[PDB]
Amino acid sequence: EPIGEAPLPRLRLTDSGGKPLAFGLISVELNYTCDQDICELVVHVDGTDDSGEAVYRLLVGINAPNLRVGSSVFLESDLVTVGLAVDQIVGVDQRSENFSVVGTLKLSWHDPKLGFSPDQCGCTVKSFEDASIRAVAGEINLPLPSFSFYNQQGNRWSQNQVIFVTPDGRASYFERFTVTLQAPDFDFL
Amino acid sequence: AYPFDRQKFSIKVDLAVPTNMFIFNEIERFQQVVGDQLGEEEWVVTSYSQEITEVPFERGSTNSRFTTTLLVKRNLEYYILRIFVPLFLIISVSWVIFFLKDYGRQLEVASGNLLVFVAFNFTISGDLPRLGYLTVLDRFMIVSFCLTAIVVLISVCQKRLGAVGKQAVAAQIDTWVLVIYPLVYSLYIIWVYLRFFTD
Ligand SMILES: [Ca+2]
Numbered sequence: 327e328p329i330g331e332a333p334l335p336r337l338r339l340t341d342s343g344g345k346p347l348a349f350g351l352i353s354v355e356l357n358y359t360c361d362q363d364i365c366e367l368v369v370h371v372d373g374t375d376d377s378g379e380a381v382y383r384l385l386v387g388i389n390a391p392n393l394r395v396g397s398s399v400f401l402e403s404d405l406v407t408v409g410l411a412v413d414q415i416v417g418v419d420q421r422s423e424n425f426s427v428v429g430t431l432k433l434s435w436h437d438p439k440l441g442f443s444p445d446q447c448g449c450t451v452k453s454f455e456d457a458s459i460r461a462v463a464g465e466i467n468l469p470l471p472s473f474s475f476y477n478q479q480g481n482r483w484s485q486n487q488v489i490f491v492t493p494d495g496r497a498s499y500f501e502r503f504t505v506t507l508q509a510p511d512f513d514f515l
Numbered sequence: 516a517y518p519f520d521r522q523k524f525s526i527k528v529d530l531a532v533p534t535n536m537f538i539f540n541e542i543e544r545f546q547q548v549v550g551d552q553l554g555e556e557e558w559v560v561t562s563y564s565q566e567i568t569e570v571p572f573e574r575g576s577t578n579s580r581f582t583t584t585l586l587v588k589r590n591l592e593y594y595i596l597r598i599f600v601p602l603f604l605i606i607s608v609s610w611v612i613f614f615l616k617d618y619g620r621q622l623e624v625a626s627g628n629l630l631v632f633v634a635f636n637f638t639i640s641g642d643l644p645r646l647g648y649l650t651v652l653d654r655f656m657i658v659s660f661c662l663t664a665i666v667v668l669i670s671v672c673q674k675r676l677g678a679v680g681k682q683a684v685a686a687q688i689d690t691w692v693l694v695i696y697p698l699v700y701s702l703y704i705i706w707v708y709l710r711f712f713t714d
Contacts, residue, residue, distance in 0.1 A: 513554035 327353040329381035338370035406435045406471055416504070423512045424479055427505060434498040435471060441495040454489040459499060462489060477508045516711050517650035518594045524585040529570070530578050539567045539579040549585065558587040598639055598652075605632055606659060609666045610696055613689045618674040625670045632663050651711055658703060662696075 328335065339348040339356060347367070348358040358367075369386070386400070387393050409432045416426035444450060454462045463470035475482070482505040491497045530537055542565055549560050563585045569577040609628050615621045636656070643652065669692065676685040 510552045511554075515554060 327383065329383070331378055331381070333373070333377050335382070336372045336375055338372065340368050340370060342366040342368055344368075404435050404437060404471070406433060408433055420512070420514060422508075423510050424506055424508045427507065429503060431501050431503060432499065433471065433473070434496070436494075436496050438495040439468060440491050440497055442491075442493055444493055450492065452491045456487055457489075458484075458487065459489070475505055475507065479506050479508050482506075517644065517652050518589050518591075519651065519712070521586065521588045524587060526583045528581045530580075532578065533572055533574055534569060534577045534579060537579070539581055542567065542581075548583070555590075557590065559590070560585050560587055562586045594642070598642065601635065602659065605635060606663070606700075609663055610693070612666075613693050616686075618670060618677055618685070622667075622670040622674055625667050629663055629667060632660060651707065654707070662699070 334352075335354065337350045337354050337356070338346065339350075339358060340346045347360075348356050350356045360367075371384070373380075385393055387396075388399060410429060412427060412429040414428040416428060418425045442452070454465075457465075458472075459470050460472045463472065482503050485502040487501045489497060489499050530539065548563055548565070563583065565581070565583050568580050568582065570580050572578045605628070609625060612621050612624050612628075644650070669688070673685045673688060676682070
């Protein structure tokens with residue numbers, strides 16, 4: 327329901343494949359019960375049909391006819407911690423406008439889908455060495471936080487690449503790089 | 516026509532399938548064709564165009580081609596100030612020495628100024644491309660050197676005339692040179708403009 331300046335918003339409830347499943351009823355409310363073995367929902371909020379801000383509060387629940395803490399119902403994106411350190415500046419090209427840098431990059435995130443059991447390995451940490459995040463993700467068929475350098479020119483020399491995962495599900499990445507980056511914003515006037 | 520030359524940069528994208536399977540139909544402008552970046556650039560873009568045509572294929576029939584052309588030109592203020600302005604002052608020094616009525620000092624100033632002309636050629640050596648053929652800039656520097664070297668030859672002749680005893684004849688040569696010398700430079704510049712620029 328809107329807070330102020332109500333524009334009569336339109337809401338929809340479709341399947342994961344876009345097939346509609348339920349429609350709103352005029353404080354727009356709607357209900358739906360699914361009986362299939364696997365049942366995934368997507369909530370659509372449309373405002374295409376000049377307005378001042380949004381001022382909206384959306385309430386959803388499962389098996390909660392009353393409504394109006396509990397547990398989270400919507401999917402939440404993973405949170406990634408990132409750090410970068412610069413060790414050297416190899417050179418600067420003043421004609422092609424690019425520079426070379428040497429440094430260290432570290433990533434870390436938590437994902438319960440990567441967990442395992444120590445019984446089947448007799449080990450605490452898993453190892454994937456000399457492989458990028460993209461290559462490892464294809465091997466284990468799991469989504470991973472692939473990254474790239476935006477203004478990279480040519481290939482880069484990567485050293486000490488490694489990923490380690492713990493039984494809880496915490497993973498991290500480490501790499502030492504030597505890269506050349508294009509910088510067209512140089513001004514030598 | 517260096518450094519007053521204008522070039523064209525052509526970027527051609529060719530489909531690798533015959534025109535009866537896939538054909539280029541429309542051009543979309545999702546972004547500015549030529550982006551703007553901070554600072555100055557060596558080559559500036561004046562205009563651009565995009566077009567779709569058809570070209571023969573190695574299989575046979577035809578295939579589609581997408582072409583982007585950029586028209587570019589150099590930075591004229593760089594070459595005018597760095598090369599032509601210093602060259603004018605060096606040349607004008609050899610012209611003004613003919614006002615002196617002595618020739619033991621005119622000869623030594625004329626000889627000394629030839630060395631400055633050669634030394635000035637070292638600084639702009641980077642700005643002269645090392646191609647296998649003569650350009651407009653190369654031709655002008657050759658003419659200027661020959662005229663500067665001829666001044667040394669005339670000065671020697673005048674000194675011999677004064678030592679013998681004839682000074683009125685040497686004084687008349689000064690008047691003729693002071694007029695003809697600026698005329699040859701003006702005539703040559705017009706000749707260069709007619710040959711290379713206005714057809
Ligand atoms: Ca720049």
